[PDB]
Design a protein around this ligand. Structure first.
Ligand SMILES: Cc1cc(NC(=O)[C@H](O)c2cccc(F)c2)ccc1-c1cn(C)c2ncnc(N)c12
Length: 253
């Protein structure tokens, strides 16, 4: 037995860890892809549950969704069981976190470029919600850029907490509102740069509890009302993905 992945791609490196994610140039077409290797569940309703998802995911086409290419199953003989591969468009190694941690002044955070980036993330989330799907992984380490500076939501589907909503932590991610919450923090962190890791944690932890820096509440007064809405502590209160994109602040960017 020889595995499909090993014959057809020469691996470059590992990009992710949690399933594993590799970089690998396909030999036929000579382009480098992001490849997610999941070890599958051993049960026969846990297997089939997943395989109904890869079917629904592979149908997704949107500008904020990393471009899909292929999926295939393998089952090799271990030396001492059944891995699923997903070939996805490779993305720039510099994610949203990197981008933010490299621009720490109000000046390097232009109000125009920031709202632009955020809208794309919001529009991608609108799409997924309208398809009856939810992200549940919105956070800067997992918001990406394409070679051509297009923003993409990161990995989701196929089954830190500072960007998780409360219910998500102690509950069952119950509603698609958990994504509205995540967007709130992300919008703030874009418009209010940090100096130190401590500052970031202390201030986000506070903004989870609606304790905002007054300098922010002054500087961006509209944005403040949005981030408040998006954080409304009773889930059912928060806006819908659609409502956020239709907010006045997004007009003639
Ligand atoms: C591994 C990975 C997977 C996805 N999967 C999906 O969106 C989503 O599962 C999906 C599947 C199928 C169709 C469909 F529409 C959507 C998105 C992003 C990355 C990614 C992570 N890391 C660390 C990366 N590093 C460089 N490039 C990268 N693509 C990545």
């Amino acid at each position: 037995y020889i595995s499909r992945y090993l014959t057809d791609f020469e691996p470059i490196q590992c990009l992710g860890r949690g399933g594993v994610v590799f970089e690998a140039k396909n030999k036929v077409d000579d382009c480098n892809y992001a490849i997610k290797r999941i070890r599958l569940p051993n049960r026969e309703l846990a297997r089939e549950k997943v395989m109904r998802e890869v079917k629904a995911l592979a149908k997704l086409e949107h500008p904020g969704i990393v471009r899909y290419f292929n999926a295939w199953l393998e089952a090799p003989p271990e030396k001492w069981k059944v891995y699923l591969y997903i070939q996805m468009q490779l993305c720039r190694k510099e994610n949203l976190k990197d981008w933010m941690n490299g621009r720490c002044t109000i000046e390097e955070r232009e109000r125009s470029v920031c709202l632009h980036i955020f809208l794309q993330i919001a529009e991608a989330v609108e799409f997924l919600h309208s398809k009856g799907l939810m992200h549940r992984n919105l956070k800067p380490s997992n918001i990406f850029f394409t070679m051509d500076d297009v923003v993409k939501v990161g990995d989701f589907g196929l089954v830190t907490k500072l960007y998780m909503s409360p219910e998500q932590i102690h509950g069952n991610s119950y509603s698609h509102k958990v994504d509205i919450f995540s967007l709130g923090l992300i919008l703030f962190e874009l418009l209010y740069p940090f100096s130190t890791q401590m500052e970031r944690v202390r201030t986000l932890t506070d903004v989870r509890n609606l304790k905002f820096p007054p300098l922010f509440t002054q500087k961006y007064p509209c944005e403040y009302v949005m981030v408040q809405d998006m954080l409304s502590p009773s889930p059912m209160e928060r806006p819908e993905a659609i409502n956020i994109i239709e907010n006045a602040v997004f007009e003639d960017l």
